[PDB]
C-alpha cells in the first residue's frame, strides 16, 4: 500500500518544501532535496522537495497552507507520499495571477523563482509575497508536463 502521513502545520513557510522526521525519511528511503509526489483529496497532487525536521513526529508531515490547499487537505488529514525521481528541468512555464498593479514578473515571479529551483505542478496555486501585498498565481502549463523544476533558464509566460 502507499506511504501515508498525517498533515501537520509548517513553521517554515516555504511553498516548495515538506518536512518529515529523519527516522521516517530513513524508513522511506528519502533524502534531503528529493522531489516527492504527494497525493491528497479530489485526485489532487503536489510535487515538493523533502527536508528533515527534528521537530516532526515520525507519523506526521509539515506542509504550509499553500501545499495543503493544493492537495485539498486540512491539518490532521492523511496524505500519501512517494518518490518522484523522474522530474525534469522546466523549459517553459505558463503562470497567471488570480485576478481577484506593477510588474508581476519583476516584483513577484522573478524574486520567487530566482535560483530557487522550485518544483511545480500544473494546476498549482501558489502565493508570492512582495510589494507590500501578496499575490496568488495558478500554474496553467509546464514543459515538460505535468511537473518540472523551475531553473534559472526556465522561460515564464505570465498572461493569456
Amino acid at each position: 500500500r502507499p506511504n501515508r502521513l498525517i498533515v501537520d502545520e509548517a513553521i517554515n513557510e516555504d511553498n516548495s518544501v515538506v518536512s518529515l522526521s529523519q527516522p521516517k525519511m530513513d524508513e522511506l528511503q528519502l533524502f534531503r532535496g528529493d522531489t516527492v509526489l504527494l497525493k491528497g483529496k479530489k485526485r489532487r497532487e503536489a510535487v515538493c522537495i523533502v527536508l528533515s525536521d527534528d521537530t516532526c513526529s515520525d507519523e506526521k508531515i509539515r506542509m504550509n497552507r499553500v501545499v495543503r490547499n493544493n492537495l485539498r487537505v486540512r491539518l490532521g488529514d492523511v496524505i500519501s507520499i512517494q518518490p518522484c525521481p523522474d522530474v525534469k528541468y522546466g523549459k517553459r512555464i505558463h503562470v497567471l495571477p488570480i485576478d481577484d498593479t506593477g510588474n508581476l514578473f519583476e516584483v513577484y515571479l522573478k524574486p520567487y523563482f530566482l535560483e530557487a529551483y522550485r518544483p511545480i505542478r500544473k494546476g498549482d496555486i501558489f502565493l508570492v509575497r512582495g510589494g507590500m501585498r501578496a499575490v496568488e498565481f495558478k500554474v496553467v502549463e509546464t514543459d515538460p508536463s505535468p511537473y518540472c523544476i523551475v531553473a534559472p533558464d526556465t522561460v515564464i509566460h505570465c498572461e493569456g
Binding site: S16, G33, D34
Partner: peptide, 18 residues
C-alpha cells in the same frame, strides 16, 4: 560534478536560514 537533489536542498535551506 554535483548531485541534483543537493542543489535543490541547499537552495531551500538558504531560504529557511533567512
Amino acid at each position: 560534478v554535483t548531485l541534483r537533489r543537493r542543489m535543490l536542498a541547499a537552495a531551500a535551506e538558504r531560504r529557511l536560514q533567512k
